[PDB]
């Protein structure tokens, strides 16, 4: 789902 891309960016940045 393209509408989930910015959540993955936010998750990946917050992760580490």
């Amino acid at each position, epitope marked *: *789902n*393209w*509408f*989930d*891309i*910015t*959540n993955w*960016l*936010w998750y990946i*940045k*917050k992760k580490k």
Partner: antibody
Amino acid sequence: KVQLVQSGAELKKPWSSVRVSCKASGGSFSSYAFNWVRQAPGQRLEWLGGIVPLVSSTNYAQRFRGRVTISADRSTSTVYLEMTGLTSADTAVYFCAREGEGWFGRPLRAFEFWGQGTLVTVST
Amino acid sequence: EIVLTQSPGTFALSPGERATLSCRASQSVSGGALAWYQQKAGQAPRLLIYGTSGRATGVPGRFSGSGSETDFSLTISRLEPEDFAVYYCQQYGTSQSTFGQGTRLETRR
């Protein structure tokens, strides 16, 4: 406060092209999804597509595949809609919209911030 | 493509009454990715509800959203005069986002 400011009304002949700009201010730009939605006079909302600027990722409504291109200029915090092959069926108000931001900065996907709208009239 | 069908088309109510608007999807909407917007004549849409039940910032507490799968609701617990408007639902649970056709709330007489 997040604000989206669009370019002015457009008058175009059929089979020409239109470019509409949307300048964002008041927050971060590149890591949020920007979308374009249109509304023909007296009719329903219709999603056209979107872009995530940071990763240059676009997504278009299948009924406009090929006719619609969305782009972004990070240095000016501006997102653009290009639509080719115009006909009177494309006469509408065009809105840019950006997704909301929730607690902990989480992007909300739904469209919380909206431009003022841009009338595009396609006619001979 | 997920088709969203709103009902009723037009609702006639009065301030003080509860309004329940419905939005039915032709197939399950993934992860409750469903939002509700308000639109008044000549204005941009306004986000009310995101993710089925999340209340957008600055939206009054009398608005709430509910549902799952293929059936979603927007409830206005007690209408005020400024609530008479058009309401749209939208699904964004798959890459091809779609909107319902809208429900208009009119004042009864």
